[PDB]
Amino acid sequence: ASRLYTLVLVLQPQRVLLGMKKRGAGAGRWNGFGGKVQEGETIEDGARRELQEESGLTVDALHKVGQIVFEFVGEPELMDVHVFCTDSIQGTPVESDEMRPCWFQLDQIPFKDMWPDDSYWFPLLLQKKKFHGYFKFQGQDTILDYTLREVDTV
Numbered sequence: 001a002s003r004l005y006t007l008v009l010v011l012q013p014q015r016v017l018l019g020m021k022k023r024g025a026g027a028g029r030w031n032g033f034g035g036k037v038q039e040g041e042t043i044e045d046g047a048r049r050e051l052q053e054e055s056g057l058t059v060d061a062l063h064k065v066g067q068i069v070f071e072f073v074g075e076p077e078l079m080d081v082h083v084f085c086t087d088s089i090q091g092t093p094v095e096s097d098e099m100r101p102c103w104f105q106l107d108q109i110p111f112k113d114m115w116p117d118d119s120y121w122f123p124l125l126l127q128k129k130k131f132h133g134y135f136k137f138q139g140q141d142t143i144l145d146y147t148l149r150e151v152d153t154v
């Protein structure tokens, strides 16, 4: 029914790292770093692995910040996205064929060039709030309906 994904935001006091995907799901959009969780792999281990694969960064300890379930009408599998944040990383962001990373000042987060759901839950992430969300999409751009509530335990 649902498929596990990870999403990692490198969020520091005055800036956040995003990556511009070159192809595939989310191409042409700034997003965090993540992907599918593998068999026998913890969600958190999958989040660390994907951060390195896509951005070249090594994270020390991830913090759970949210869970967002995505529905795309006409697609059978729900996307169960486990969202993490970190402020302590190692390495320098690496641009590859697949991904172009860039730091953004918090007052210049490029929401018009991001998935539209980000405009709803990023304000919570920036104020250190935890959340459970659900977004029903039609295509890649239209949110048909959604729920989003703050939680004390992800």
Ligand SMILES: Nc1nccc(-c2ccccc2)n1
Pocket (backbone or CB within 6 Å): 005, 006, 007, 031, 032, 034, 035, 070, 079, 081, 115, 116, 117, 118
């Ligand atoms: N910001 C945002 N919005 C919608 C979907 C996603 C996503 C995250 C991880 C993996 C696949 C999709 N991310």
